[PDB]
Design a protein around this ligand. Structure first.
Ligand SMILES: Nc1ccc2c(c1)CCCC2=O
Ligand SMILES: Nc1ccc2c(c1)CCCC2=O
Ligand SMILES: O=C(O)CNC(=O)C(=O)O
Ligand code: NI
Ligand SMILES: [Zn+2]
Length: 331
């Protein structure tokens, strides 16, 4: 078996290898990349997402989110307080202000230490889930707005035609902005391109060990667990690497820098934080191997999760027994 220790693998495709997206994902899996839950892909030197990022300041962040923490330094939840709209130019200025700017630090490890020590005492503002793309329409390779759709994948694999669309989302981050422990909707893959700015550090649990993380989460957030059998779907819980280690949870970590792609694999729990002002673009996607994960994906039916229109068809076709209960949750 390839990659039995479930290490995060890093790939350096040639420009020829970068032509066929599906083929390269399959190649990465043939090398065991999926066992980690996360892979890094460094694009060939000849490739670029777009010409420059000089003209992005007028993009609107309609609903910036202030991420307010509760709990202890290594075990906390965050809730999102809506703030007034601001442009990317305004957001960048805010990120760089004394209140929000990245502190002096020696290296990524030093910054990681500072993050886990001090995150809860601040409330950074995140521009998340903004529908759009920064890939040039003429970028033919690994253009996140030009991927085969999940609806077409489901149709190709299972013969059923379904409604729904899936398009990319932009994320504008600043120091300490945080993504909580989660897998993707319907345990899909995700792909994330860091377009510009400071790094993003990721933590990931191998898919074969996801239930170990779930069990610890139930222990650490007992009220939340009683409220919902899939409360990690709410995307609000954080657990530090120190606490994971103390509890014997298998995980890995890696830092993504501008110009790099990360792929998360079905049922690969991940969490992380931004180092400073940055912009990432991400989208969910599927492959034939995903179908079995989609069929088995846990669902939130307590009403907290609240998912996109397109998830309806996924649950309806892949999980017909769960559909009625889940749909009651959406309404
Ligand atoms: N349009 C703006 C300008 C500044 C700010 C906001 C919106 C909300 C976040 C806090 C802030 O300084
Ligand atoms: N796709 C995700 C997953 C987690 C999170 C976000 C988007 C933004 C809101 C905060 C968070 O933890
Ligand atoms: O970048 C972020 O804030 C969160 N991204 C993801 O969880 C992802 O790409 O799957
Ligand atoms: Ni994700
Ligand atoms: Zn729930």
């Amino acid at each position: 078996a390839q990659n039995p220790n479930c290490n995060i693998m890093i790939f350096h495709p040639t420009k020829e290898e970068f032509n066929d997206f599906d083929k390269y994902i399959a190649y990465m899996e043939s090398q065991g990349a999926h066992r980690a839950g996360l892979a890094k892909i460094i694009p060939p030197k000849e490739w670029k997402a777009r010409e420059t990022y000089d003209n992005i300041s007028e993009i609107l962040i309609a609903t910036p989110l202030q991420q307010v923490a509760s709990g202890r330094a290594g075990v906390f939840t965050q809730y999102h307080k809506k703030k007034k709209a601001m442009t990317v130019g305004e957001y960048r200025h805010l990120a760089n202000s004394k209140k929000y700017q990245t502190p002096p630090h020696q290296n990524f490890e030093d910054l990681e230490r500072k993050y886990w020590k001090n995150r809860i005492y601040n409330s950074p503002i995140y521009g998340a889930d903004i529908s759009g793309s920064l890939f040039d329409e003429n970028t033919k390779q690994w253009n996140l707005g030009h991927l085969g759709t999940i609806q077409d994948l489901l149709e190709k694999e299972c013969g059923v035609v379904i409604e729904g669309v899936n398009t990319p989302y932009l994320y504008f981050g600043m120091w300490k902005t945080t993504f909580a422990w989660h897998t993707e909707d319907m345990d899909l893959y995700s792909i994330n391109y860091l377009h510009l700015g400071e790094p993003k550090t990721w933590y990931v649990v191998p898919p074969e060990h996801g239930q170990r993380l779930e069990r610890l989460a139930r222990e650490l957030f007992p009220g939340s667990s009683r409220g919902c059998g899939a409360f990690l779907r709410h995307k609000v819980a954080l657990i530090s690497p120190t606490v994971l280690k103390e509890n014997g949870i298998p995980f890995n970590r890696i830092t993504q820098e501008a110009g790099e792609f990360m792929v998360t694999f079905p049922y690969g729990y991940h969490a992380g934080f931004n180092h400073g002002f940055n912009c990432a673009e991400a989208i969910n996607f599927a492959t034939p191997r995903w179908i079995d994960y989609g069929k088995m994906a846990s669902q939130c039916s307590c009403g907290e999760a609240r998912v996109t229109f397109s998830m309806d068809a996924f649950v309806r076709i892949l999980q017909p027994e769960r559909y009625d209960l889940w749909k009651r949750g959406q309404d």
